[PDB]
Amino acid sequence: KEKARYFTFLLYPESIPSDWELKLETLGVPMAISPLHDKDKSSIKGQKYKKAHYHVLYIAKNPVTADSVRKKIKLLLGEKSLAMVQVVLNVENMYLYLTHESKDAIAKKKHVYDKADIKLINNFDIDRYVTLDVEEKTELFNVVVSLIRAYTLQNIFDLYDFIDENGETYGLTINLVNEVIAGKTGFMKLLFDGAYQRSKRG
Template identity: 25%
Template sequence: MNEKKSRVIKDDRTRNWTFVAYPESVPQNWRDILDEQHIQWIESPLHDKDLNADGEVKKAHWHILIMFEGNKSFEQIKGLTEQIHATIPQKCASVKGLVRYMVHLDNPEKVQYDRNAIIGHGGVDVAEYLKPTSSSRYQLIGEMMDFVRDNDIIELEDLAYYARTERFDDWFPLLCDNSAYIMGEFIRSRRNRAKSRQVLVDYKTGEVYN
């Protein structure tokens, strides 16, 4: 009796791919070549301060993430990276993780690059991928609470203005999106407690009363 063996064909396609581009290797119009694909793609800041394990500065490079609406094969993407003389493409397991890595957001031991220097092409919303994780969100809320206590903040306006001018990349989006309520209640509670501790004095008689 002949047994039929099922053959599983491995699909190497995926929607999101990443590669590295070196300034001295890519053509001058490399961005135009990618834009002409009419896709969404993200360009990291130029990594020109990264270090090897021995402390030597790595060659300056960009991390590139390209995103498609449908799956693309390795050969299809390799044809594109060869056009701009970039490295061999690799599958991107996490878009959010890679975008955060573009500025070493979760790697404080590495050089921190400016998140505002991340460039989104094709209408991609980079800020969406830079939103804090749940654990980091709680840490940032804790930082704001400490700031309120240390600086005797009694109005949400003062915290919001400071966040907009001094902590625009982390505190301000958090306040605008979903943390204004808890911070407003925290400040209100402190203000009410301060009022309850006030000693009222009748300056005519000198009598102290609550």
């Protein structure tokens, strides 16, 4: 009865309608689908590859429960397309996993698939699910502060422009600055005020 937003499960071509992809789209939910996993080293006796399958990365809008997600997929594709739906405890790791390009896949030397074969439904983008921890945010925010003093950046445009240029040096991007300074605009306003009247003293 746990409730989460990130889920994963398998679909096999053998028990899904041909237009399954367009159907999954009608759910309005964002999804990542693996290249076809058709070259997975099996370890059954005398079997080279596993039964071919897709991995689906599925992110619900609000915390729901695995079972709810399962009945939804069953109703959509047929009661015979789904048995189990794990909750994903690490979206990044599991996104990489789709192409077996994650740390645990790399170490197990699993077959690597093609990024270009991944299917993105409903504007899914992994970039939106990897988000800073609290300490990274603190860390980056302090970097932002030293940038603003170091360069007497008078306002957010000036900061933005500076990031456009020198961003990589400091590990920063436009979107990352936005995530970093969220909830801290009061503090930002102190900084730009400071920068503003400093520049006026020169």
